Copies of this chain bind each other. A is one copy, B any other.
Amino acid sequence: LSSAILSEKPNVKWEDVAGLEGAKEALKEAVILPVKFPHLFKGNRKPTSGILLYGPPGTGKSYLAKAVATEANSTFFSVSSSDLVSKWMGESEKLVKQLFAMARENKPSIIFIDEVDALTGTRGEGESEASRRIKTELLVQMNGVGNDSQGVLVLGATNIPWQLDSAIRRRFERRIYIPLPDLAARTTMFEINVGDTPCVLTKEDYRTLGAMTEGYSGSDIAVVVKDALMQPIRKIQSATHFKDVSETRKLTPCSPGDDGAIEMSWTDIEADELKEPDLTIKDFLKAIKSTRPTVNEDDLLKQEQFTRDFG
């Protein structure tokens, strides 16, 4: 049997995710509003049962699922494609039945599924038995004869929504496209991902950054901020020569031959008594020259096709 139970909460708050307030609105009214205000949702007025998120890779879908998982205050299940597909013949499907069953047992609950494109695609006869049996149980077990469709919430994610079948497209009754973040949201993600590190710039300088970075993803922002945090490490471990500055001794990397320039390596230098140089904009522009964006623009044209129709 083994009951396939998996549920754990990380820490990602609301405003960690920047921008796209339609999805924030729909998920606050789909998650917080049923739990905090159950009396409003009564009779004809019912909460949303199936919500699909989609878009290009790294626009913040699974991180938003993390934010819902932290801000849930509910039995947050989560399952990959691993725990559903079993060995023999029968546990591949009865575990789905027990998943939504015990999900309804621990109601109010939220279910997230990542990359539902691995379970769809009934057109043709490829991926035959797994697609028909497992996908059929996802349909009928999602709603069907005597399933309590109230209670639980099914969060779907994908990168390919056009290969998603129209029936499961109707199952995910409120679908939301997640675009590449605009100027202001990327300004916000810059001001978030700098964090507690002492920066040097102002808000309109972050606006200059977001103007320079037209058309990235969230991971692209995470790695240009990472590289911006990782240039002074290369300055400290780099080359030969440090120097004292200023609570008892403190040395930082400096060029060969300078005011107090001893010749050494980071290894030579004592615990703590290292001075790493500030973060800097030059670090930002160096990170811009480091990495090209990952997303392709014809795939964005297909996202504008399915979004322009069904979004």
Chain A contact residues, CB within 8 Å of chain B: 4, 6, 8-10, 25, 28-29, 33, 36-37, 39-40, 43-46, 48, 57-58, 62, 65-66, 69, 78, 80-83, 85-94, 96-97, 112, 114-115, 117-118, 121-133, 135-137, 139-141, 143-146, 159-160, 163, 166-167, 169-170, 173-174, 193-197, 217, 219-220, 222-223, 225-227, 229-230, 233-234, 236-238, 266-267, 271-272, 274, 276, 291-292, 294-296, 299, 309-311
Contact = CB atoms under 8 A, between A and B. Distances in A.
Contacts of A132: 4, 81, 86-87, 89, 117-118, 121, 127
Nearest to A217: B170
Contact of A37 (B57, B125, B237): B237
Contacts of A48: 223, 226
Contacts of A80: 97, 136-137, 140-141, 144-145
B4 A234 contact: no
A282 B276 CA distance: 53
B45 A128 contact: no
Contacts of A89: 85-87, 92, 128-130, 132
The quantity of this chain's copies bound in the complex is: 6
B144 A114 contact: yes
The 9 A-B residue pairs with the shortest CB-CB distance, nearest first, are A44-B195, A87-B136, A86-B132, A118-B136, A78-B145, A87-B90, A57-B167, A8-B146, A45-B229
A309 B226 CA distance: 14
B85 A133 contact: yes
A123 B112 contact: no
B90 A39 contact: no
A220 B234 CA distance: 34
Contact of A85 (B93, B127, B140, B229): B93
Most buried by B among A65, A88, A137, A222: A88
